[PDB]
Symmetry: C3
Subunit: 89 residues, 3 copies
């Protein structure tokens, strides 16, 4: 089966659901008005996510894994950028 | 192995743990006084969860996947109801 | 592929990422200053996590699964201790 991860924030709420399907992770978004496909699109067979608010601004971290390699993807208001995470050392 | 997803809220806390085991997802609940099996029981091989508070009221979203189909299940105070989520379009 | 779970707290933030790799779960930690391997090291093929604050103190629950057995691991300020969780009854 496909594998998913979810996060949410605020009281609307906003929800983001990430799905790993055939080696690709995609993103589905709710901001109160309907579901839409988000900008996130990166390789992975497994996904997890966390997020936090700084005031009203959301910050999201998606951890995408293929084989033994886990890559962190960061949203901080300006598109998806690679994070400093590594699995060891 | 079985696959799990967890969420929690407040300072007690309350915890909910969802487990996909042989194509079925079940729910275990802590509200401070012991673990009990919850009402949630729906098909799935994979599960993720998120939740949020509106005042003191909890809202939970469980994303259950089998094959390429992901179904959203909603708790909003009145049992489990199907959500509008779809994976694409 | 390896399987991960993530949680975070506060506005720094602190992040914890748990990874199940070849039957072992390990922990990676960010507290604002770099990634380091945490103390958590327990068996599992699948992992999920949740956490909550009581004032400034973090409490973490990691759910580690092998076969049909799910064990809860608790951080409450004093190392990792076994929790009361069981999957049924
Ligand atoms: C890629 C990275 O490590 N990002 C860091 C960020 O580093 C920047 C450098 O990559 C370079 O671009 O120069 C700038 C300016 O000096 C930074 O040093 O440093 C941030 C501050 O310590 C890290 O924290 C987040 O920064 C976000 C903006 O990028 C945003 O402000 C957020 O609120 C901050 O927490 C940032 O690290 C990334 O985020 C943290 C939470 C971890 O996930 C880490 O692994 C990420 O790389
Ligand atoms: C099934 C669904 O889409 N639920 C919506 C809800 O729709 C209702 C209709 O299904 C029908 O029953 O008529 C009523 C009254 O007009 C609604 O339109 O609409 C809600 C408001 O926009 C959605 O938001 C949540 O509603 C909950 C009560 O059902 C509760 O109040 C919660 O706080 C609201 O966020 C609701 O959407 C569902 O929840 C959101 C967060 C997503 O998960 C979405 O996919 C769910 O379907
Ligand atoms: C192992 C366990 O069940 N821990 C409980 C804790 O039980 C203690 C006993 O194991 C023994 O050591 O004697 C002491 C003193 O009487 C306790 O009874 O009882 C706590 C209070 O109800 C539970 O709640 C958490 O306790 C943490 C400290 O251990 C911390 O204060 C936290 O804020 C409390 O929520 C504790 O249960 C564990 O945590 C909860 C949230 C669940 O995850 C549960 O399955 C865990 O076992
Ligand atoms: C902050 C926010 O919600 N921005 C929306 C845009 O991005 C979507 O949400 C962010 C958080 C991240 O999940 C993106 O990958 C995702 O596409 C969105 O593109 C825009 C148009 O629909 O709406 C913004 O509000
Ligand atoms: C709000 C709440 O905790 N309700 C409890 C009842 O439902 C349990 O919790 C909700 C949030 C959801 O997880 C359910 O599937 C779950 O069964 C519960 O049945 C009742 C009796 O034990 O206790 C309520 O407080
Ligand atoms: C509360 C805290 O951050 N403690 C740090 C120590 O433990 C690390 O974090 C806790 C929450 C848990 O994740 C541990 O398994 C993890 O090792 C850490 O060992 C110490 C030295 O780096 O720094 C503390 O602040």
């Amino acid at each position: 089966s496909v594998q998913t991860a979810a996060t949410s924030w605020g009281t609307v709420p906003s929800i983001r659901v990430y799905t790993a399907n055939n080696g690709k992770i995609t993103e589905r978004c709710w901001d109160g008005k309907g579901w839409y496909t988000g900008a996130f699109n990166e390789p992975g067979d497994n996904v997890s996510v966390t997020s936090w608010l700084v005031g009203s601004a959301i910050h999201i971290r998606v951890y995408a894994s293929t084989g033994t390699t886990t890559t962190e993807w960061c949203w901080d208001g300006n598109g998806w950028t690679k994070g400093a995470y590594t699995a060891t050392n």
